[PDB]
């Protein structure tokens, strides 16, 4: 789950 | 390096025809776009209401339920992307 979490934090 | 990373991403995008974009509803959602031409896409939210969000070829609840289980229970992003891609391509 941590790869999507990192992408979401970056996109945010 | 930042240059080399950008070049490798472009090649992955060309090889897989898979682009990772900010979500068009919430920018912190993740939008997976399949195809040269944005023909298919699906959005996922990390810790909101819907894990599986919108998708251009909309998907039935049975299909959406399967995708959530692959993503949340199984925690297998490749598997999720494989199933989502097949499902979306088959609803065009």
């Amino acid at each position: 789950q941590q790869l999507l979490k990192g992408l979401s934090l970056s996109f945010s | 390096s930042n240059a080399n990373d950008a070049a490798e991403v472009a090649l992955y995008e060309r090889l897989l025809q898979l682009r990772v974009l900010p979500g068009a509803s919430d920018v912190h959602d993740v939008r997976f776009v399949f195809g040269d031409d944005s023909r298919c896409w699906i959005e996922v939210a990390m810790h909101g209401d819907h894990v599986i969000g919108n998708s251009h070829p909309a998907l039935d609840p049975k299909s959406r339920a399967t995708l959530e289980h692959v993503l949340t229970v199984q925690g297998d992003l490749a598997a999720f992307l494989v199933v989502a891609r097949d499902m979306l391509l088959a609803s065009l």
Partner: protein
């Protein structure tokens, strides 16, 4: 473009490994010691390469 690191991790998490020193792409779907090797030095179309990769990522 700080997002590019995370994109590369996502792509690598699929088991697709760019191996440009050898002008090829590796596909590690099972982590069982077997790989699929897709050469890039050929006349294969982009469509064919994409179809192949997803075929190997599937079942």
């Amino acid at each position: 473009a700080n997002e590019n690191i995370l994109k590369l991790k996502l792509y690598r998490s699929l088991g697709v490994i760019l191996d440009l020193e050898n002008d090829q792409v590796l596909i590690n779907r099972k982590n069982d010691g077997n790989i699929d090797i897709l050469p890039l030095d050929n006349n294969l179309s982009d469509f064919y390469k994409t179809k192949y990769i997803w075929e190997r990522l599937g079942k």
